[PDB]
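Structure request: endothiapepsin, Cryphonectria parasitica.
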Amino acid sequence: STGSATTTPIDSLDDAYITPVQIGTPAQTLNLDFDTGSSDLWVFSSETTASEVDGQTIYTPSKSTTAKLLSGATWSISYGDGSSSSGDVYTDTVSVGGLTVTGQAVESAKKVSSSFTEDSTIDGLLGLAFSTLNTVSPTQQKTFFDNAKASLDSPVFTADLGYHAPGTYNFGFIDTTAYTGSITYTAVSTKQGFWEWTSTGYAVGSGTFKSTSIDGIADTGTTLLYLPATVVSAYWAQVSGAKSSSSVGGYVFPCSATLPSFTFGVGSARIVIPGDYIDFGPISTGSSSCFGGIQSSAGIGINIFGDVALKAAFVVFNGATTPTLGFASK
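Returned structure:
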């Protein structure tokens, strides 16, 4: 089997991407944030505290003939941005882009933090990291990809995120028309439950490439590119007027700037992030100070290849017995 679904930016800044997901019988379609940095499939629901719902589409298990309460199971998750959610668990039929999993754990939110409530466009998350991070207790549950894997033509999914435009998540096949040149594959460590890999270095603009190992995670659920302070300082030093602002919470730059590209290494290959991808616009409406798309990972504890980086590539998440990651230009 295979699946193919279009993923669409939630706003003009590509702050996140939503992909339609069919849950239950008859289908209830919710727009979920596919997140390769977590492993819970959770949704706004009929059980969510009413004051914490503001425009989201909810899953109502009682209206699904295939929904079954997973008795005794609860979940609770906290994300890197400080947001969180928790609730109980149903199993139900879940389909993405024509690919169907029966008995998928669907984590129903009883509580969500303000960031989720305030984002009307995201109806929940679909985790695509390794199932060892799944928060369901007392019986840990598998991700959608893990459940689908055996049925897929090939044990892979691909992320093809757009810049200011729709893209695609495919399951079970590599669309050879979706990228240019070759795909370069690189080793993955699953020791922390993430798609963790080591970039071979970077360049700023038309500058020379610096060979240096940068361990980080491929995380579709994180907006920006978070790298070591040395790397980030070298980037922003090429933008006149750029500075790190503690009051804003990162590097800002004059909105009148033309930003240089940023290149990262994948083995001997190179992925180029155009400068425009690194512009996240005014810090506040009407401001001429703009927020940077490359920020320091210092104090996160991990480097994160978020959407800024991933959307410059066609990315293969290879879930073979020994997982690997593939990157191609596009």
